[PDB]
Every structure is written in structure tokens, then in C-alpha cells.
Structure 1
């Protein structure tokens, strides 16, 4: 994983949000979190091959802090629909 992505993961707040792993400007995986800190840190110790791939292929990680879990829900759904990232099913 790129050092800047690791750094961004470790600095992420304990707040609800949506995250977007990207490569060459293109979203490759979108997810949401009740706590960005907790969810993103899971990427450092991959429990699945897919999680490994996402963190290795990404050259950028964007995070969007949101008001609450209801917002995370709809923002995530909307962004997935818009971008249809590689790793989202």
C-alpha cells in the first residue's frame, strides 16, 4: 500500500463517512463506515484477498466525512451507482 494511503488511514477520524479508493483518478472501491478510523484500519490487516487487492491497486484514498449514518448510507449508494467501481459487487 502507498505510504500516503497508510498515513491517511491512520489519521482518519472516528466519524461516519464514505471512502473511495482510486487508481489513476478512477474509483475502484467505495465503502461506508460508522467510524472511518475503525473501518479503514481493517485495510491494513486484510481479512480477504479482495481487501488486499484494493489496498495494493489504489494510488489514492479519498474520505468524505458525513453528518450521520443515514447520510453515509445514501451517499455510499449514490456514489456506487454513479461510478460502479471495479471491486464493488
Structure 2
């Protein structure tokens, strides 16, 4: 995983949000979190091959802090529909 992505993961706040792993400007995975910190840190110790892939293929990680879990739910759904990320279940 790119050092800058590890750094961003370790700096992520204990706040609700949506996260987007990207490669060459294209989202490859979009997820939500009740706490960005907790969820993103799970990528550092990959529990599945897909999680390993997402973290190795990405060249960028974007995070969006949201108002609350309801916003996270709908923002995530909308972004997945918009971008159809390669690692999103279809």
C-alpha cells in the first residue's frame, strides 16, 4: 500500500463518512463508516483477498466526512451508482 494512503488512514477521524479508493483518478472501491478511523484501519490488516487488492491497487484515498450515519448511507449508495467501482458488488 502506498505510504501516503497508510498515512491518510492513520490520520482519519473518528467520524462518520464515505471513503473512496481510486486509481488514476477512477474510484475502484467506495464504502461507508460509522467511524472512518476504525473502518479504514481494517485495510491495514486485510481480512480478505479483495481488501488486499483494493489497498494495493489504489494510488489515492479520498474521504468525505458526513453529518451522520443516515447521510453516509445515501451518499455511499449514490456514489456507487454513479461510479460503479470495479470492486463493488454488482
TM-score by length of 1: 1.00
> Residues 55-87 of structure 1: CA distance to partner in whole angstroms, max 9, x if unpaired?
000000000000000000000000000000000
Give the SS at the match of 1:42.
helix
> Residues 2-47 of structure 1: CA distance to partner in whole angstroms, max 9, x if unpaired?
0000000000000000000000000000000000000000000000
Q: Mind listing any 5+ residue stretches in structure 2 that lack a counterpart?
A: none
Q: Mind listing any 5+ residue stretches in structure 1 that lack a counterpart?
A: none
d(CA) in 2 for partners of 1:88, 1:55: 14
1:64 matched to which residue of 2?
Answer: 64
Give the SS at the match of 1:18.
strand
d(CA) in 2 for partners of 1:5, 1:63: 11
Moved over 2 A (4+): none
Give the SS at the match of 1:19.
strand
Aligned length: 89
